[PDB]
């Protein structure tokens, strides 16, 4: 989530005065090249380095990755609602997330570098196989970075993290 280890250099700037979604690239600043769903979407030659996705009311979405002087970084699955990606389903006030990789092993989930879906003492947070259910989802509290990884593996080793921002 907060860390960029694991080639997860793409992060969302949560410091916007207006409802605009800005993306940042954590690479040695020479020139930043932005990509969206594999296609190049911009090339920042010095000066500015953040990529603006527009207003959050437009529900920006896609697999975003950047690249400096090294190879392209891992994708950042952006999912706003105001490689196989994570599946997001909204039904009323319940948000369901599906782990893209479900080989049948014990799937663990983490939100903002904090494990979730393990304890049964949470009625609004349930984990069923590769599906994580969030009942009565809180926009200000339950939004952020999400990642699914199997027991024994590092969360930073995931192919990509999911950035969920939903108003329900």
């Amino acid at each position: 989530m907060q860390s960029i280890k694991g080639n997860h250099l793409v992060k969302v700037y949560d410091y916007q005065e207006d409802g605009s979604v800005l993306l940042t690239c954590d690479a040695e600043a020479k020139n930043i090249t932005w990509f969206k769903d594999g296609k190049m979407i911009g090339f920042l030659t010095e000066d500015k380095k953040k990529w603006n996705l527009g207003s959050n009311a437009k529900d920006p979405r896609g697999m975003y990755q950047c690249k400096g002087s090294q190879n392209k970084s891992k994708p950042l699955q952006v999912y706003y609602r105001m490689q196989t990606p994570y599946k997001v389903s909204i039904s009323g006030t319940t948000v369901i997330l599906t782990c893209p990789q479900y080989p049948g092993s014990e799937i663990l989930w983490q939100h903002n570098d904090k494990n979730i879906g393990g304890d049964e003492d949470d009625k609004n947070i349930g984990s069923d196989e590769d599906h994580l259910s969030l009942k009565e989802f809180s926009e200000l509290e339950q939004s952020g970075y999400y990642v699914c990884y199997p027991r024994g593996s590092k969360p930073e080793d995931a192919n990509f993290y999911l950035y969920l921002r939903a108003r329900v």
Partner: single-chain antibody
Framework: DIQMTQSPSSLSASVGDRVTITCSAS?????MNWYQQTPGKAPKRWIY???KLASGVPSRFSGSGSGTDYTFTISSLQPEDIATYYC?????????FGQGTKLQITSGGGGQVQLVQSGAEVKKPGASVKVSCKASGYTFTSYWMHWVRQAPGQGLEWMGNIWPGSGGTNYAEKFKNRVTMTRDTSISTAYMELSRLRSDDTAVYYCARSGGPYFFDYWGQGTLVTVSSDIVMTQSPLSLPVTPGEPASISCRSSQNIVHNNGITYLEWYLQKPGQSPQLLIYKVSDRFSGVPDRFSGSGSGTDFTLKISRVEAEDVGVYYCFQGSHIPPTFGQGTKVEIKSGGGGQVQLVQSGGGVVQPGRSLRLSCKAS????????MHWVRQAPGKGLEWIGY????????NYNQKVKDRFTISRDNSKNTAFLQMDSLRPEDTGVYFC????????????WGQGTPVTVSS
């Protein structure tokens, strides 16, 4: 499963030379772990994350590599570096360990004096037993093969010598009419025949080799001859426990003055580490033998002698027997079984139990008691080490959630359970087979370090008819 290949399988290097061990994985591994495993001990983690040295690991060791190629480097090989080095991958279950690099010190080309006894003798009352000691690496006719016995519940007691050069034996008064020792110079092997076996003769009889300034310098493996139906030196402490790092001290008192007429005191202390034959620690009243760290430092004069260990370490556990030879029949004391006060508790410790000899097809349950940390916060893994084979992962269990994963070879015969209230993990083996014989060790898996940092002492399991 990702296959790990370690090269070389056995490397001989001189003291101070650079020893490099390479580990090849069948598939790219994110992190490779390096463990140091001495003979008879559990593997000790040396390098984690492929480049970070474990706590206490000397800077002369270094790990490097990425993907499927990893390298382990010892900048300056030392005599203490003699151990089995194995590389382990944690990217995918089961945790795969390489065949292991048997690291030996080429320095010391002169034949290592290694006496081997017969061993495993079981007899009946009133019988006679003959035990041999194949002397190798030394001119068998230039050092007396003194033979000593250590009965259960008693200290070392000399059983008389034999000077293999001439066959002219001395003998012990307690066996002067019962035990005869004869040399066989051709095969470089002394023999000792004790006649009229009684109940009190059931013991472990060892073959020493009286060196220049120290008696019983290089001791044989030791033969347990179980048969069933004098300057007295007393060791003041007995089973005196100490804390890891806390200094310990054992005192020994002699019946008379142990100052020989020659002016040299033949007082010594042998440290029979648990499961090994005694190895000299204080060659004379004060001098420490070679190969023994400066931690052991005895003292004493007249008739009073006390050995002061500067810092009781993990290795020093074992009955330190004090022997005096300035009298005719050299006699050893009771011996203080110095043991760790913390034991299975204190720091992070895994106490392994439940081993033994079982018949094929029977069931055996192993237990690993964890103390010093939150049992539910770490995964407990089980590893089996067959005689002459490398480390094989059996399975692991998470105490917090109860999720279990096992190797496909033992998934249908081994069951891993845990007791969070006792902070103990259980490895239940059903339908035991001869191939299951080996040392079963439990290891604590630190997800933060992606390496098993704390491992149990190992429980020997023997499947024999």
């Amino acid at each position: 499963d990702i296959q790990m290949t370690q090269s070389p399988s056995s490397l001989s290097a001189s003291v101070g030379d650079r020893v490099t061990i390479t580990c090849s994985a069948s598939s790219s591994v994110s992190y490779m772990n390096w463990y140091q495993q001495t003979p008879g001990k559990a593997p000790k983690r040396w390098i984690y994350d492929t480049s970070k040295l474990a706590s206490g690991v000397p800077s002369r060791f270094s790990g490097s590599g990425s993907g499927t190629d990893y390298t382990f480097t010892i900048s300056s090989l030392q005599p203490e570096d003699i151990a089995t080095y194995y590389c382990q991958q944690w990217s995918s279950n089961p945790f795969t360990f390489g065949q292991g690099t048997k690291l030996q010190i080429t320095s010391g080309g002169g034949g290592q004096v290694q006496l081997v006894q017969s061993g495993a003798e079981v007899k009946k009352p009133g019988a006679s037993v003959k035990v041999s000691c194949k002397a190798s690496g030394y001119t068998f006719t230039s050092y007396w093969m003194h033979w000593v016995r250590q009965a259960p519940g008693q200290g070392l007691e000399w059983m008389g010598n034999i000077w293999p050069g001439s066959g002219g034996t001395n003998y012990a008064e307690k066996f002067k009419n019962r035990v005869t020792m004869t040399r066989d110079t051709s095969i470089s092997t002394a023999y000792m025949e004790l006649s009229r076996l009684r109940s009190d003769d059931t013991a472990v009889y060892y073959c020493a080799r009286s060196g220049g300034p120290y008696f019983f310098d290089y001791w044989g493996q030791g033969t347990l001859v179980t048969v069933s139906s004098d300057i007295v030196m007393t060791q003041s402490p007995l089973s005196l426990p100490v804390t890891p790092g806390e200094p310990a001290s054992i005192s020994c008192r002699s019946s008379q003055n142990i100052v020989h007429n020659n002016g040299i005191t033949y007082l010594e202390w042998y440290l029979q580490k648990p499961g090994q034959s005694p190895q000299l620690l204080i060659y004379k009243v004060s001098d420490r033998f070679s190969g023994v760290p400066d931690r052991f430092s005895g003292s004493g004069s007249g008739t009073d002698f006390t050995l002061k260990i500067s810092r009781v370490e993990a290795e020093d556990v074992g009955v330190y027997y004090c022997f005096q030879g300035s009298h005719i029949p050299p006699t050893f004391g009771q011996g203080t079984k110095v043991e760790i006060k913390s034991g299975g508790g204190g720091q992070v410790q895994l106490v392994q139990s439940g081993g033994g000899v079982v018949q094929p097809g029977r069931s055996l349950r192993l237990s690993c008691k964890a103390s010093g940390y939150t049992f539910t916060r770490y995964t407990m893994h089980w590893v089996r080490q067959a005689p002459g084979k490398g480390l094989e992962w059996i399975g692991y269990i998470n105490p917090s959630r109860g999720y279990t994963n096992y190797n496909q070879k033992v998934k249908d015969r081994f069951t891993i359970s845990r007791d969070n209230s006792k902070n103990t993990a259980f490895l239940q083996m059903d339908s035991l087979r001869p191939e299951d014989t080996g040392v079963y060790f439990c290891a604590r898996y630190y997800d933060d370090h992606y390496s098993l940092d704390y491992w149990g002492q190992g429980t020997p399991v023997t499947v024999s008819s």
